Amino acid sequence: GSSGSSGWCLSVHQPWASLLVRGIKRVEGRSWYTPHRGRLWIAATAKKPSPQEVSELQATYRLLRGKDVEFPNDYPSGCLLGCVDLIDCLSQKQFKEQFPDISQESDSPFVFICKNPQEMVVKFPIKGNPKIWKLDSKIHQGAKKGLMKQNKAV
């Protein structure tokens, strides 16, 4: 019937986190389901991406989307990167069923399909969480502003 059209933010574990707002990860892995459909800000958790996951994922995705993929210069932590439009959230079953091309991209039971990945120009000192949490009134705006400019790639 109705839902809070507020700017929510879902933290992610790098590098994936960045890969999302970058345009490589069009899906999110979570052990829970979120009927939230619309805009969802992606933030990089406090965890740091290992040199094994980045190097591996870099080559892994390169063959999943194309060696001509993109990749960030670094991977920050505890800051808002960008945002992704959550189209739908399928499960290990539906996800692959409909999106069998990215059935491996995620392992979680409930995959959150996102699109229009954009990385904000300015990051804010925020804390991530394994679940969905309403952004800070002050952050909401700033985040909407950081979308004034993008990298040279896009």
Swiss-Prot record:
Keywords attached to this entry: Acetylation, Congenital muscular dystrophy, Cytoplasm, Cytoskeleton, Isopeptide bond, Metal-binding, Neurodegeneration, Nucleus, Phosphoprotein, Transcription, Transcription regulation, Ubl conjugation, Zinc, Zinc-finger
User: What pairs make up the disulfide bonds?
Assistant: none
All copies of domain ASCH, residue ranges? 10-104
Major place of residence: nucleus
GO annotation (BP), single: positive regulation of DNA-templated transcription
Tell me the superkingdom of the source.
Eukaryota
Localization terms from the record: Nucleus; Cytoplasm, Cytosol; Cytoplasm, Cytoskeleton, Microtubule organizing center, Centrosome
A GO molecular function term, named singly, is:
protein kinase binding
Q: Is Repeat among the key words of this record?
A: no
What cellular component terms from Gene Ontology apply here?
A: centrosome; cytoplasm; cytosol; neuromuscular junction; nuclear body; nucleoplasm; nucleus; protein-containing complex
User: What does the UniProt record tell us about how this protein is modified after translation?
Assistant: Phosphorylated by NEK6.
Q: Does the keyword Nucleus apply?
A: yes
Quaternary assembly: Interacts with the thyroid hormone receptor/TR (via the ligand-binding domain); this interaction requires the presence of thyroid hormone. Interacts with the androgen receptor/AR; in an androgen, testosterone and dihydrotestosterone-dependent manner. Interacts with ESR1 (estrogen ligand-bound); competes with UFSP2. Interacts with UFSP2; competes with ligand-bound ESR1. Interacts with DDRGK1 and UFL1; the interaction with DDRGK1 is direct. Interacts with NCOA1. Interacts with EP300. Part of the ASC-1 complex, that contains TRIP4, ASCC1, ASCC2 and ASCC3.
Tied to what disorder?
A: Spinal muscular atrophy with congenital bone fractures 1: An autosomal recessive neuromuscular disorder characterized by prenatal-onset spinal muscular atrophy, multiple congenital contractures consistent with arthrogryposis multiplex congenita, respiratory distress, and congenital bone fractures. Muscular dystrophy, congenital, Davignon-Chauveau type: An autosomal recessive, severe congenital muscular dystrophy characterized by neonatal onset of muscle weakness predominantly involving axial muscles, life-threatening respiratory failure, skin abnormalities and joint hyperlaxity without contractures. Muscle biopsies show multi-minicores, caps and dystrophic lesions.
Q: What's the stated role of this polypeptide?
A: Transcription coactivator which associates with nuclear receptors, transcriptional coactivators including EP300, CREBBP and NCOA1, and basal transcription factors like TBP and TFIIA to facilitate nuclear receptors-mediated transcription. May thereby play an important role in establishing distinct coactivator complexes under different cellular conditions. Plays a role in thyroid hormone receptor and estrogen receptor transactivation. Also involved in androgen receptor transactivation. Plays a pivotal role in the transactivation of NF-kappa-B, SRF and AP1.
Q: What is known of its domains?
A: The C4-type zinc finger mediates a competitive interaction with UFSP2 and ligand-bound nuclear receptors. It also mediates interaction with the transcriptional coactivators and the basal transcription machinery.
Record's protein name:
Activating signal cointegrator 1
Organism, as annotated: Homo sapiens (Human)
Q: Which residues of the full protein are shown?
A: 435 to 581 of 581
